[PDB]
Design a protein around this ligand. Structure first.
Ligand SMILES: *[C@@H]1O[C@H](CO[C@@H]2O[C@@H](C)[C@@H](O)[C@@H](O)[C@@H]2O)[C@@H](O[C@@H]2O[C@H](CO)[C@@H](O)[C@H](O)[C@H]2NC(C)=O)[C@H](O)[C@H]1NC(C)=O
Ligand SMILES: *[C@@H]1O[C@H](CO[C@@H]2O[C@@H](C)[C@@H](O)[C@@H](O)[C@@H]2O)[C@@H](O[C@@H]2O[C@H](CO)[C@@H](O)[C@H](O)[C@H]2NC(C)=O)[C@H](O)[C@H]1NC(C)=O
Ligand SMILES: COc1ccc2c3c1O[C@H]1C[C@@H](O)C=C[C@@]31CCN(C)C2
Ligand SMILES: COc1ccc2c3c1O[C@H]1C[C@@H](O)C=C[C@@]31CCN(C)C2
Ligand SMILES: *[C@@H]1O[C@H](CO)[C@@H](O)[C@H](O)[C@H]1NC(C)=O
Lengths: 535, 530
């Protein structure tokens, strides 16, 4: 028996595994139960803490993926399969993972906690791209990641009811953070230096923990990659959540529409998990891209008000945040619905297809609102150029859903006391399989932040390995000190501020400082458009 | 006795005067009456044709200026005085002027007809800057300009009423155009080749003649300089016209339309002038009290509607703008502006300036303006705020109405030529920050730089000569171009080509502020309809 691979946490004893990494051994504790399995009667309910156990639990492999829709748009394509589940689907999925240096740190070590994305309907901490071994080895931090319920299982809400209160997926995340506080020290981790990070839906989740006081005491810093809690896709109002829940129930035979919430939920609880998943997409109000059926609900509880309001009206002194976007936030989403789009051709759309795309990309707004979008994204010296139109629709979708929500967050946090750092990730991986026109799409900085290029079995260039090490260093510097900059002659990454609005480009070249996160575009989305929607 | 200066027109006999230019003499007939004096009972009424006279009318000097407000913002300043009346004010002001080559052309000569601007409340055909002598000498056209009633006298309207029907100043212009049809041959002019040109409110006037069928047969080509009939300032609705006429009556102590007009008719002209400004519904720049009214008669619909629904095959138009349409108007009411400093305003002033420059719109509409015209990387930079507010006022009032006219006309059969005039005159007395302001291409079109007693460079003289040639070429053929050697292409809705006019050779460019005009012409109307 190896002492390094044995750990006692509040619930009982654990046995882990020793991982080989290019730079030396790391201890991994994979598949640690942190909640009672949300099975049967516990479906849709807040997570209950894992009851203590006798004997030794083997934390030696990733546990099951929470139930979720499995993408089949491009079967076998690396760009899709890399995000699909790599363990069996089960409702019994509430497990977290701890990676620690080998041997275990002697003094308390800063902790990175990863929260995966997947549009709140998919994802898993077990994916190859979230492998924490390289980060832990390169930077000597402790890394934790958790599974949390997605789709209806995590975010179906009948607001008011005790039986399906909503936001249980976020509560899963909270429970894991509480677990980190109570237990991370046993792995050599410092519960007083915990940095959350997540991408997309995971980034939006991070932001929601920022805006929810019971979560806010469980970490100290935040990293939001390509996502913000205030994005128009990340939350839903109480009535729209109820409408969607009720529509799903109706689609699967419950009750034999609406009625007693207790009874409706009881009928949903008898439906096989896969049955719910198969009907998930059918509850959305209109045809769209970047819209997902079951997402966090603004119900006054987890979120006391909309994330926009909470951001605008919050005191963020003492908080450090790192935020950023990839170069082409919108391109990935266009090949999943927008007319005229494919990863397999140039997607050189016509004007009519562009206008149609605007309604898909900006769903459920007035015609006037749509006209305003068309006005600001049309080049009136070239209104019909297909390549320009393609780029413009990509910007529309990307600005609306990601860049502008991130910019508003960054700007407001800065103005209200937070030290903020902002980046744009501009490197397109040598191994990227999406067509060239998509540029650097949503989600493709992650592999670099996690140091995946160091994986010997993969075919990244040597420069990309150097780049990955640079990025991990920034992230870990931020985790440790609240500042990504090196504790010399190397170019400095300046704070982002509401006035100067400075951010850095992340690519193979050194840091270049720039101004404004799509400032002209984001003034439209963040300042004007909301006034138009009120009138 | 010089027989070249004796002319007989339908109404009787005229005596002109020989004028000198650096290129030789020209014949001028100035102060020819074309209407009965619109005085007493005739105030506010449509013009009546001038009754025949016996003997010889002295046509050797300019006649009286129509009653109008006199600008005293910068007393004695050249940039203001060159526009002010240079003859006594009188309601007896309906005279026109003819300039012709000397000796008088013995064969049909193409005719240019000038309609002055002045916001529809001022202006005169006698101003130095409208002197026809250089154009006529250099380009051998006949040139006609007329006075027309302005302010309340030309445009006060109680719609429906016989006593003040509105648009009479426009009918003064039409009557002069009719006079040209009937009499211009007696001077060597060819009534079958009449080109209208005008600037600002004059340009708006030309456009209105284009869109009004009884005028459309009195001319053949049109030139619209820094103005358009679809400008948000150039017309007013029946309801607002009535409100303004009513407010004027009240302000001057008058009370039924008949009684109201009758009481107005008893008031000295100067008294109407004194209260003219005070009938506007809000503090503004680029808005004027008495302008043409859309009442179904002269204009059967709004100019925008008429423009969109017209067949313009057979028409050639020359349209254009100066480099800095908005700047001049900012020193007449925009907070923080003066000709005497840098006018480096604050964001607060910029924001206050927007409500002034875009009066009578919703807060939402104003916010949209602020969104479009703010550089969000530099939201508070005074220099940029000054340029942007100039852009707001100029795009909204001039550039974009002109762009729309050009686009629709071109797309509906017209052959259109477009220009931007980008030369700042060496003699210009407005500060450098104003750039090339509204009105300051005119002196070049009329070839004023050829006047020896003025201080233009030799380059500017050559330039004026180029410009006179473009304009006169257009009047002769519907195409400004000289024989090939760089060519001035037609403006089209798609390619949107126009040329820059300055000391350098023609340079072709695309888009009359296309991004900004998309906002004013495409988006903003939709917003206002909701
Ligand atoms: C680019 O591709 C889209 C998507 O169509 C699919 O992908 C292509 C690579 C090709 O294999 C198509 O046959 C596939 O259907 C094309 O848009 C489709 O057009 C067809 C009719 O031509 C229509 O039935 C589909 O509904 C369309 N799909 C969408 C989402 O609009 C598009 O025409 C291609 N562009 C080209 C070829 O220039
Ligand atoms: C530039 O001048 C404007 C206009 O003010 C006038 O012109 C000046 C040259 C000077 O003679 C002023 O005294 C004149 O009144 C200034 O705007 C005015 O500011 C004053 C206070 O100083 C205020 O009471 C007025 O309301 C303002 N007038 C307007 C048009 O709003 C402005 O301050 C000057 N800007 C600078 C210094 O760049
Ligand atoms: C809102 O962002 C997303 C919405 C849906 C999905 C993903 C998103 O971001 C991508 C990267 C990462 O976040 C996980 C999955 C993504 C790629 C895989 N697709 C199939 C699911
Ligand atoms: C709408 O344009 C204008 C409104 C009012 C005035 C002028 C305008 O354009 C200028 C040039 C010319 O047309 C005549 C007068 C102008 C300059 C003199 N001021 C005093 C009056
Ligand atoms: C709904 O039905 C259940 C099943 O018996 C019952 O116990 C419960 O009280 C009902 N709830 C409401 C609010 O009617």
């Amino acid at each position: 028996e190896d002492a390094e691979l044995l750990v006692t946490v509040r619930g009982g004893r654990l046995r882990g595994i020793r991982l080989k990494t290019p730079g030396g051994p790391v201890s991994a504790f994979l598949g640690i139960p942190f909640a009672e399995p949300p099975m049967g009667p516990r479906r849709f309910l807040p997570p209950e803490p894992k009851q203590p156990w006798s004997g030794v639990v083997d934390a030696t492999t990733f546990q099951s993926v929470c139930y979720q829709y499995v993408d089949t748009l491009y079967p076998g394509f690396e760009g899709t399969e890399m995000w699909n589940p790599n363990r069996e689907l089960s409702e019994d999925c509430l497990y977290l993972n701890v990676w620690t240096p080998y041997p275990r740190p002697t003094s308390p070590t800063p902790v990175l906690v990863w929260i995966y994305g997947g549009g709140f309907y998919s994802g898993a901490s077990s994916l190859d791209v979230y492998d924490g071994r390289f980060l832990v080895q390169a930077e000597r931090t402790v890394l934790v990641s958790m599974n949390y319920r997605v789709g209806a299982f995590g975010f179906l809400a009948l607001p008011g009811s005790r039986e399906a209160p909503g936001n249980v997926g976020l509560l899963d995340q909270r429970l894991a953070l509480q677990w980190v506080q109570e237990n991370v020290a046993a792995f050599g981790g410092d519960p007083t230096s915990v940095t959350l990070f997540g991408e997309s839906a995971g980034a939006a989740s991070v932001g929601m923990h920022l805006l929810s006081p019971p979560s806010r005491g469980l970490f100290h810093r935040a990293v939001l990659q390509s996502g913000a809690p205030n994005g128009p896709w990340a939350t839903v109002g109480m009535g729209e959540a109820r409408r969607r829940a009720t529509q799903l129930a109706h689609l699967v035979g419950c009750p034999p529409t609406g009625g007693n919430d207790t009874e409706l939920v009881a009928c949903l609880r008898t439906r096989p998990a896969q049955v719910l998943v198969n009907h998930e997409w059918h509850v959305l109000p209109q045809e769209s891209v970047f819209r997902f059926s079951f997402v966090p609900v603004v119900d006054g509880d987890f979120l006391s008000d909309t994330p926009e309001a909470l951001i605008n009206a919050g005191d963020f002194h003492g908080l450090q945040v790192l935020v950023g976007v990839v170069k082409d936030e919108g391109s990935y989403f266009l090949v999943y619905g927008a007319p005229g789009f494919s990863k397999d051709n140039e997607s050189l759309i016509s004007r009519a297809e562009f206008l149609a795309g605007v309604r898909v990309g900006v769903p459920q707004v007035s015609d006037l609102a749509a006209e305003a979008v068309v006005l600001h994204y049309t080049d009136w010296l070239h209104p019909e150029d297909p390549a320009r139109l393609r780029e413009a629709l990509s910007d529309v979708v990307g600005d609306h859903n990601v860049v502008c929500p991130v910019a508003q967050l960054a700007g407001r946090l800065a103005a209200q006391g937070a030290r903020v750092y902002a980046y744009v990730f501009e490197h397109r991986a040598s191994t990227l399989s999406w067509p060239l026109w998509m540029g650097v799409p949503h989600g493709y900085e992650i592999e670099f932040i996690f140091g995946i290029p160091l994986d010997p079995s993969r075919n990244y260039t040597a420069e990309e390995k150097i780049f990955a090490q640079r990025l991990m260093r920034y992230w870990a510097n931020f985790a440790r000190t609240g500042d990504p900059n090196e504790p010399p002659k190397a170019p400095q990454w300046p704070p982002y501020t509401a006035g100067a609005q400075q951010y850095v480009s992340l690519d193979l070249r050194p840091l270049e400082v720039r101004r404004g996160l799509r400032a002209q575009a984001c003034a439209f989305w963040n300042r004007f458009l909301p006034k138009l929607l009120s009138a």
